[PDB]
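Narrative progress, year one. The postdoctoral researcher (J.K.) led the effort to move from monomer predictions toward full complexes, under supervision of the PI. The following entry was the first complex the group processed end to end, covering 1856 residues in total.
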Amino acid sequence: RRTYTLTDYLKNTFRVKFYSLRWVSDHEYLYKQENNILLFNAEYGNSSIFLENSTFDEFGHSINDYSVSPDGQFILFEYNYVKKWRHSYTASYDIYDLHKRQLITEERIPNNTQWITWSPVGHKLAYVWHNDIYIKKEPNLQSQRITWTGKEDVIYNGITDWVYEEEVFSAYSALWWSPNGTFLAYAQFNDTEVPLIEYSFYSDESLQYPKTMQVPYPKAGAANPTVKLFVVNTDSLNSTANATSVQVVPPASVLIGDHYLCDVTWVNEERISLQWLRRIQNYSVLAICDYDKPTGRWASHVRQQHIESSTTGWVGRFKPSEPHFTSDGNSFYKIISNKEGYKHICHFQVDRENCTFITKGVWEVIGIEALTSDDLYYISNEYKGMPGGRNLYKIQLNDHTKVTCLSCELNTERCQYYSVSFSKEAKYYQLRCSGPGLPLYTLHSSSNDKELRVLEDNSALDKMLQDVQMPSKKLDFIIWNGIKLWYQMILPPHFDKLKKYPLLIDVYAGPCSQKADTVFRLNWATYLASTEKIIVASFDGRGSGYQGDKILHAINRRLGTLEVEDQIEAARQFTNMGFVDEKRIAIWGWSYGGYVTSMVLGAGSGVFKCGIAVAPVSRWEYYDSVYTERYMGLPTPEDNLEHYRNSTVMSRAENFKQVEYLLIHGTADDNVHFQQSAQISKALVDAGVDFQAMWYTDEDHGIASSTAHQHIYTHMSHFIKQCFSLPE
Amino acid sequence: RTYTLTDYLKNTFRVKFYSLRWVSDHEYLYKQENNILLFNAEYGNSSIFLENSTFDEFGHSINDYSVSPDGQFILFEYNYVKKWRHSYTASYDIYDLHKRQLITEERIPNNTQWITWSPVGHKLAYVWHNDIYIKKEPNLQSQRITWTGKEDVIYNGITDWVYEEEVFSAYSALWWSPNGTFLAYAQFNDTEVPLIEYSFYSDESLQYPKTMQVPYPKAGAANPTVKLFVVNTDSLNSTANATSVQVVPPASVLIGDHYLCDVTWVNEERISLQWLRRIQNYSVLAICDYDKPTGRWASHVRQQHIESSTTGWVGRFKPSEPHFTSDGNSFYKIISNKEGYKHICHFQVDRENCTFITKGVWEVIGIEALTSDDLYYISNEYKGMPGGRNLYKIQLNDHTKVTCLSCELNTERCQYYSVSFSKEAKYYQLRCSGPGLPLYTLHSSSNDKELRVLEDNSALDKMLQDVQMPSKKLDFIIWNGIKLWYQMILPPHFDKLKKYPLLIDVYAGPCSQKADTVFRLNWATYLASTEKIIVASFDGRGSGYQGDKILHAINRRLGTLEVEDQIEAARQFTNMGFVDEKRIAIWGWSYGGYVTSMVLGAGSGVFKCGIAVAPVSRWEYYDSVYTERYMGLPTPEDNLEHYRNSTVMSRAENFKQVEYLLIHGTADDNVHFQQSAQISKALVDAGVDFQAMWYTDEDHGIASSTAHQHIYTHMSHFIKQCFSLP
Amino acid sequence: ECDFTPMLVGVPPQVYNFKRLVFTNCNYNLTKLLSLFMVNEFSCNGISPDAIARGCYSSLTVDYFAYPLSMRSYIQPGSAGDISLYNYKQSFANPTCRVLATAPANLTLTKPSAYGYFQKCSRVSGEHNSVETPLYINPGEYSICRSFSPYGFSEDGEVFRRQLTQYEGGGILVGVGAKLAMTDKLEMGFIISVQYGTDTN
Amino acid sequence: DKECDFTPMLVGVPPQVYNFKRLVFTNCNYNLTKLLSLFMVNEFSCNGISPDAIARGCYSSLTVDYFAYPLSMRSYIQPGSAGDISLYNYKQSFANPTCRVLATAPANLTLTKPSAYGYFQKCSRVSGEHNSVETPLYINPGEYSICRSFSPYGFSEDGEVFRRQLTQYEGGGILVGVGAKLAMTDKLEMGFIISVQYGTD
Ligand SMILES: *[C@@H]1O[C@H](CO)[C@@H](O[C@@H]2O[C@H](CO)[C@@H](O)[C@H](O)[C@H]2NC(C)=O)[C@H](O)[C@H]1NC(C)=O
Ligand SMILES: *[C@@H]1O[C@H](CO)[C@@H](O[C@@H]2O[C@H](CO)[C@@H](O)[C@H](O)[C@H]2NC(C)=O)[C@H](O)[C@H]1NC(C)=O
Ligand SMILES: *[C@@H]1O[C@H](CO)[C@@H](O[C@@H]2O[C@H](CO)[C@@H](O)[C@H](O)[C@H]2NC(C)=O)[C@H](O)[C@H]1NC(C)=O
Ligand SMILES: *[C@@H]1O[C@H](CO)[C@@H](O[C@@H]2O[C@H](CO)[C@@H](O)[C@H](O)[C@H]2NC(C)=O)[C@H](O)[C@H]1NC(C)=O
Ligand SMILES: *[C@@H]1O[C@H](CO)[C@@H](O[C@@H]2O[C@H](CO)[C@@H](O)[C@H](O)[C@H]2NC(C)=O)[C@H](O)[C@H]1NC(C)=O
Ligand SMILES: *[C@@H]1O[C@H](CO)[C@@H](O)[C@H](O)[C@H]1NC(C)=O
Ligand SMILES: *[C@@H]1O[C@H](CO)[C@@H](O)[C@H](O)[C@H]1NC(C)=O
Ligand SMILES: *[C@@H]1O[C@H](CO)[C@@H](O)[C@H](O)[C@H]1NC(C)=O
């Protein structure tokens, strides 16, 4: 096409190719080619077939995923996939033998399995079914029930509740095998007193009476689910008796009230690292627990406890960072805040409370990626002082002053945003470059840090984009009150600084979020800039992360304050830059982004003509506890109830009479409930304010169904094409 | 100066009425400036029955009153809380007329569901917590009659949801005897009736919303069972329990699911019950006599009366109620004649046949008063216009002598009448409502003379002289040999030469009439006066008051004909020269939204935009009593295929040509938000863009002041943008 | 010497489920049975008054059931009501005696939960099920609605329904029950009919 | 004058290790060996005196600390032993000639078995600004644990947590205590700590 059209984005015309691999050893990996699982050798790139697609289609079902046992002798086949919430899902499983090249029909894995995983060595299987854990010593053998207390929507064994999957664990799993599979740690969640959100699901046209969903959801201040961590010995099992699980009690400083389990890290087969976080999330404790062979318990001693807190805000970015232990298990490295306030790597000892920092500067370490007996690999935003960039670094564990970047100068103009995937023992690492150019996947060797070959160069997309007028990206910063705040502009093709374009402020503005980056994207903003000639701009004001504790903790105990004002100030700054039409400035967002957009449209600053709020927040008393209370505390008069009430969207309803407002929300949203947008429209009606609205029947937080995804962006296109008076 | 939208939403030009309550054969009560006044009908002299200073001194705003028949006590209603259309709960304090005191001994409890006096004396029967209580004297203890009362399961003296909305059109299910010897009541059992469940979000202070649960019988679902009981109130030993005898319906309706649609007391030892099958093609009226030594009420086959429909349903919605002569051995009833028109028939108790006294190519709307020599009835016979209502009187001795009592009082101003007679039918008040300003007059039945004018709206007339008000044409068009009627609200200074945009207002439900002679000051008045839009309505097939052959044309075929006639009317309106064929729209509420959606989904290219407010989408989603009356049961052995054919979602692809606005309330208990939720899901599945709006916690009316003014303001911007009106 | 033990033992039947004891050759002796009941009514008719104490001991048939005295007016000859049409109707072709009596304490007679009679027993037939032809009993015979609830009714006004097969005429049989409260003493009713013969006795 | 009776150690349910009951006797003489025959002694270490010279001698006092103790935990009651028992439950004192006896009670003896065994995993004090300082509270020889009042009879589950606010007079902060539960053995295993002083009665 001549320009990047909406059809080109809604339907996928210009596709980005990826190279996803699974490291199965220290020098080999698996890769799927035309539904053929292929085994590659990292050194010389020579490959061989691991499973043919003739095998894939002897079944009577569509295979969704696969999982090879860490012994190379069995393959787990996933099918009957059924989505539930963000990470959770239920599916069936069939175990496939590789030496016999057959399926196992003796003692199968039941339907509607919630979680399943292999032991880190061998072929042991532990899975969660009906909120209970079952362990299979051998695939052909019957499973042994580990827990017997599991109840639907009350007690979860091995799996998370809603708030643990969404906000603290970012996963549906709570199973942790030991490094050799002798012990199996798991968490038990009790949602008995947790209140229930009840919304409606209308389903297919055949359903006469709709359905009422019930999700144990702790809103702001509500009762939280209690958590216990049990460890069971898988090598002392007996099919004749019931299995015994031992509970590891948390440290006493966290048992004074409500708390959370935010991390579980195995050090060795008799030492396990647990990270507990209080309900008021500015005090965490990494508890190192050692097993006792005589009694069979796990001892959490205060002498091996390490306190990580924060006086200016919350611990970590979204939670305390996970530990990274050495081989001996008597020390670990983790990312905490320095005295200046920047996230850097500190060197802890198991029995000494203090830690030594190995990195420093006006930059942050994004994540520790590998730790060997001599080198530590970490990803940071240090290169060129750009917070929106990421590169791989290597630091010598004996001379910390010897740091070498491994991805900065490989292709400085094409790649400034890197991830990595190390092989076992960190012998080979795959570099995944996201932007600012077309994505580039390469494989390297850790010995000499030399690149071996290009895995994916996206050559097909480069030739497809030659005859299209693509929009450019301007990544720069401004200085507001002596503070560097970065922005990002997607400039239309043949951008002329003399002309005045309509501006669309893309906003999320959530805590630790980052909208200004060096990442390539073929999104809806690409269509608005290429075809309709609209400058799309994002701005990382106060509260944005990857820049230090000062900027991140500027919205502590006060959400809906500085991040809203900085979005208003950014539009003024973009206006007086020269190439923005002051009369046509809009702003749209999703979830927290829609919340800020509703707060901006309710400020009455006259800068914005229209705005679109998609599944927005309206009152922080309506959102879940773990997320809201982390930044705003408890909504009681003895804490921060007043800031909960000054930061409502309903309280600014009268100012919406100056703007054109589009409110969108899914009827089956489980994260930000339709009650949030229901109170918004109920306030604007009580104030005599007109607006446009659109509900989507039985849609979740992301309107991600194919029919609904195209409908929400075609509707928002017409709203912007009218608000900006553009030809239809 | 034109009739603006602000004048309609802020109620600037207000119409006046005169609501009275006949307390005798020649007296009535009138609430004037918060003073209850007694009037002598013959001469018009008034008395202060109760004053200003009496009310507004109790500590709460009084909602309504109920003077006892003996003029000794008044009920005082307050703490009013609405619930569905007719139901509500409130508090009550009794006031003694003689002692001038508020009774404080054994007060009526809070959250009382229903209360009523006996037809004579000062006896009270109220329903509290789904149980009936009898209060003989206002200062004595009430006597509990029932003990099976349970919320959303058993209803004693009150109705459930589907009886209140569709069968009884009232929350009440209590019927006193003519002079208070007995109290007939019904009992409803909603144990196996499924529950509709929707969310209520309440005020901003509520963290977790509430899930409302109402026992709702959808098409084919389990219906509530009905049992009628009679209790002797004059044999009420205050130390014993109350005994309720049950009246068994005849065997013709006990073969399956049946309804109770009428309870009319004939005399103190005779009661009239009308029963209706679940398939509403067959009805029975049972005249039950009392048995003193036995104590029961028996329905015998000789005093039973069968009325059924071979082309549709019995009655316009339910079978018509009877009116018994003062001796109790005969009654007059509105049934359908051989040619399909509904007229008055003279029934005997133990004779199966009846004799029609009224006959013609018109229909009798209702029987109003029955004396020994005259029967008073409202009809639409005048000028052959089905949209009119006039009072008639007929001699029972010589049926030929029939007199119209209202046809020529002010034929230019008054063509739509309603009447309110006094006791023994001595005096009657005529309530005209169009096509002129409403005129309320008082009359006398002897000489049939107008005594005085009670209300003429002289203030509204003066206010409407300096505003460019629109006009209203009421004509007809013959099509395929049948005469159908329509009405247009023409803009002021109507030029027959210029092309105007057209908005078609539609309801089109069974036995509806959107073409009448009633004065209105509504949204269509603003659209015609200010925006110069022609607002028109059409009553095609399915509309009533024109004969069974026209009403029963949509039987078991809803979504057909009634939708096509709205499309064909738009074409014939274009054939009149003053309609812009490129600016035609359609809008409706409830059934109107259903027909509007089916019209827009028909792909006829006649309509550009359209609005559907709280519309029905699939008839399996709506309640049983209404839907099954016109469509039967949704089974492959009945009419399942036309349930599936007449869905709005089936026509979602044709919406790519129209601009569609869909509005629905989130707390709608009648046409649930589910109905609109499936419409939008089909429009998204079909790749169709449209406009939508939800109103939080709003009922089927969207009638809250802020909400009512928000929906018409939104529909104004949509129609104007669709019509390129600034 | 034909002891009437069955009429004296167990819970008595309801009027619609009346039981009959027919004796042909066995010699009978009354007054023995009469001495067991307080005759609140001994209205004999037909041919023999109290001379029924004798005869030739030929075809002595006796019906017995539980019948309250509050309904005594509906067991008399020619009496209208729901007993004569749907429960019991005495046959006045042969000599007969109608006996109503209350029972003394623990006269090995059990107490029914309550009394019961059918107030309606009709057929809903015809096309569209419009014709309701009430089914009245014949003297001496039973009711067609007897099959519904012989034990009794759980509620006054208990409705019953059954499809009358093609060999049963067609349509729907509807029977409505009526329930009377239990009297403090067991009240009964007996009909004693006797026939003659052309051979012996 | 009389005979020191050991009956409270033989009747009822014995206390837990952290809630041990203590009997001190004066102005009487004892028959110590008849108690040893009642139980199956599994250990008898006597620091300060001899395993034999304890049953003979007139003293100024004779004390016996008795409680229910499992033999699977016998190593954690030994002298100088670390672990949870000596830190938050019971630590034997050596300021006097003493013995330590772990014995099993037969069903012939009239002492009942408790529901299960119990000891305290943790008994710490959370203090300091922001409740960051946590100091475990260790018991002194012969004394009681300060977490004793949380669950006297026993614990309901393993890892049971108890919290309590320490008053201003009790120093400050929050006292935290975690319990531990062991399955009850076949026969009741007990623990006896005998001590002795002097002064010639
Ligand atoms: C899940 O939580 C509930 C409490 O919320 C626990 O139920 C309690 O059980 C005890 C023992 O029977 C009772 O004394 C309490 O009354 C119960 N509380 C409630 C609210 O029911 C339950 O034991 C917990 N389950 C697990 C596995 O920990
Ligand atoms: C964690 O945050 C809470 C705020 O919720 C801090 O509590 C405050 O503590 C100071 C004492 O230094 C009091 O003066 C404030 O009144 C407290 N605030 C509230 C809302 O109670 C707590 O100190 C923080 N903890 C750390 C380790 O920083
Ligand atoms: C109209 O006038 C008649 C008299 O012609 C009134 O009758 C009397 O009304 C007064 C006031 O209500 C009563 O106190 C008398 O008892 C009435 N007279 C008799 C003989 O009973 C009639 O009430 C008047 N109507 C009003 C005032 O509304
Ligand atoms: C309302 O109807 C229900 C049936 O839906 C009646 O409940 C039944 O009662 C009978 C006899 O008592 C039982 O055998 C059934 O098991 C009951 N069914 C159910 C679902 O409860 C109930 O008695 C009726 N109530 C009234 C007042 O008539
Ligand atoms: C009752 O309504 C039904 C229509 O719903 C009519 O019953 C039909 O009767 C004819 C007899 O000629 C049958 O062939 C049809 O199959 C019946 N319809 C159904 C749906 O079963 C009947 O006309 C109505 N009853 C009366 C008295 O008018
Ligand atoms: C199966 O794999 C072969 C090997 O490359 C490939 O040519 C073929 O297209 C594949 N077919 C399917 C259905 O995956
Ligand atoms: C899963 O369910 C299907 C039918 O619902 C059944 O055929 C299949 O056997 C089930 N899976 C197992 C492992 O039993
Ligand atoms: C009755 O009271 C109202 C105010 O409550 C007052 O305005 C009015 O004048 C009173 N009526 C008369 C007739 O005075």
